[PDB]
Amino acid sequence: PQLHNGLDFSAKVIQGSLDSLPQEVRKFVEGNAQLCQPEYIHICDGSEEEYGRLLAHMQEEGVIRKLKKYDNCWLALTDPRDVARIESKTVIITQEQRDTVPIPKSGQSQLGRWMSEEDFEKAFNARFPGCMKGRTMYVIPFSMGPLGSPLAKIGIELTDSPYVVASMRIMTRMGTSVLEALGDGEFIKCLHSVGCPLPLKKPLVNNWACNPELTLIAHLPDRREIISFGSGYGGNSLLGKKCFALRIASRLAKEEGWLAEHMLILGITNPEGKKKYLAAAFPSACGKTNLAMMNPTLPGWKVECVGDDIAWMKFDAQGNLRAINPENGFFGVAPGTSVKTNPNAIKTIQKNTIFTNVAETSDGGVYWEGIDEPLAPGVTITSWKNKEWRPQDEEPCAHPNSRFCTPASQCPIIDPAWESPEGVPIEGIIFGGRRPAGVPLVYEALSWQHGVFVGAAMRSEAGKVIMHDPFAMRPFFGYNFGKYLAHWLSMAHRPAAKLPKIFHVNWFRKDKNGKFLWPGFGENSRVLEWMFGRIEGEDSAKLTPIGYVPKEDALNLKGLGDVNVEELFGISKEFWEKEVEEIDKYLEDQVNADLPYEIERELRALKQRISQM
Ligand SMILES: Nc1nc2c(ncn2[C@@H]2O[C@H](COP(=O)(O)OP(=O)(O)OP(=O)(O)O)[C@@H](O)[C@H]2O)c(=O)[nH]1
Ligand SMILES: [Cl-]
Ligand SMILES: [Mn+2]
Ligand SMILES: [Mn+2]
Ligand SMILES: [Mn+2]
């Protein structure tokens, strides 16, 4: 219905048809077209043709550069004001603040950022009206998880950024098949704008549209909406990556009885032909992607990658914890990636990959700190700021959190079940962070409840600062962390639930000279071997106040020899007395009235065990 001609946007559709869309999808698209006033509407089909044409268009406009040395690889350099996920501008809107974060006892909550509905309404009206003027609104239908998986969820992202379209094609399952699978079902509404309507009011920097002053990444779980404005970058703009995958999904999981977690999933096979799947939650910069595609050093062992960042997990009727990787690609940190630290990533990213904010070599290759690769004489480097750069300079050639964006199907060790709609059965969950002192290489939680406490007590080095990052989810909780703990704990009362063993690792313990005690990377297969046997029930553990650690000689150290096991597994009363005190202060303040009894009990129990050593 229409008294004039400003409500039907059919005349502006340059690919697809509004009449083809499911009724509620059409209302989403047309309502925001009316608000944002795009010049064109492009309904993405996900085809190779649309993808290649969009890439070529971005190339002609200077938005991306083709990397000549590789096969269909591309480089985007951003406005340096728009280089990362920005927590201070990431908010969750609920009626009551207590649904989004626990009310802290004394301090400010660091477990989330709540915004009232009225405040968001003002912010929204100050940003989105007319924000796509002169631009194409792309409609991205995408599936989080294998199409038709019982654990998959569907989203529709509206964006004015072709960079987002290309990246979402890699990181999600995108296109016409998703719309047909959606039918009249439920979907998450995702609205994104870089916030630079034409004609441009402010200078465009590095051909990268963004609006840093007005950047705001909002989540409305009760409306099943994600609304992001002002950033074109990564987790701010690829709304499946963190906004859907963790923040919205963790609320859905709370309501529906499953788990959405900042975890890799890997499958490990031992020399006896036995295969187990493990999940691991490490904070950013703590090596999930290295572990997920590890090249094991132990002969006869094999590791295969299901996902490197996000896990959606649900106990099935048989009681197995079944996990899917809801992503379709890897959005990995580039700096530090080398043949030594991640050879399988190096193989994956040389075709069909989009790089953002890395350096470019004069022969059309990529470069970054820690690449640990020499360049032939004559080869020169352009920094991520589009300036000539030489290794004898201070500033980095690549942004510290520059990324590659690569299809998961290309990983040479992608797991054969990485797209299985039923998911893979998780037998162990690993927590870990950067702890230069005090925390052993590996230990095993004494019970599910103790394991949940271990996840809750996770800390990690940021002068050095040791921060709290419970479950590696501190930036990503979609709801009250205290209820999230209760949700985890409630899994132990499920029907026939086969609870995975929980472990905590530390690759980063250092000696008094600051050298790593453990070589890490592929040598972490030796730690996975110990976990593997522990899941099988092997008698390879000794009890300590913090949990089980490997017996003397239980860890396979053949081929190392120069490793200080006593210091690596040293457990100091002095350190752990201070550690439990800090955990106690943290949980009391930050979780306060929503701290489950079982977690307080595990804290008291650990305090008591440490007091007796
Ligand atoms: N010493 C040591 N460092 C490691 C090991 N594994 C990974 N790293 C370091 O971890 C960093 C890479 O971590 P990231 O890619 O940022 O970790 P991530 O968990 O994948 O982070 P996100 O992609 O943001 O979720 C580099 O500094 C690596 O050197 C290890 O076993 N030992
Ligand atoms: Cl354009
Ligand atoms: Mn990663
Ligand atoms: Mn991550
Ligand atoms: Mn309980």
Author numbering: 3 to 464, 472 to 622
Authors' text:
To demonstrate the capabilities of MMQX, the conversion of oxaloacetic acid to phosphoenolpyruvate by phosphoenolpyruvate carboxy­kinase (PEPCK) is observed with a time resolution of 40 ms. Here, millisecond mix-and-quench crystallography (MMQX) has been developed, which yields millisecond time-resolved data using far fewer crystals and routine remote synchrotron data collection.
As the unmixed and Δt ≃ 40 ms data are isomorphous, maps corresponding to F o,mixed − F o,unmixed can be calculated. 2(a) and 2(b)]. As the Δt ≃ 120 ms data are no longer isomorphous to the unmixed data, we cannot use as sensitive a method for analysis, but general inspection of the data suggests that little has changed in the active site between 40 and 120 ms.
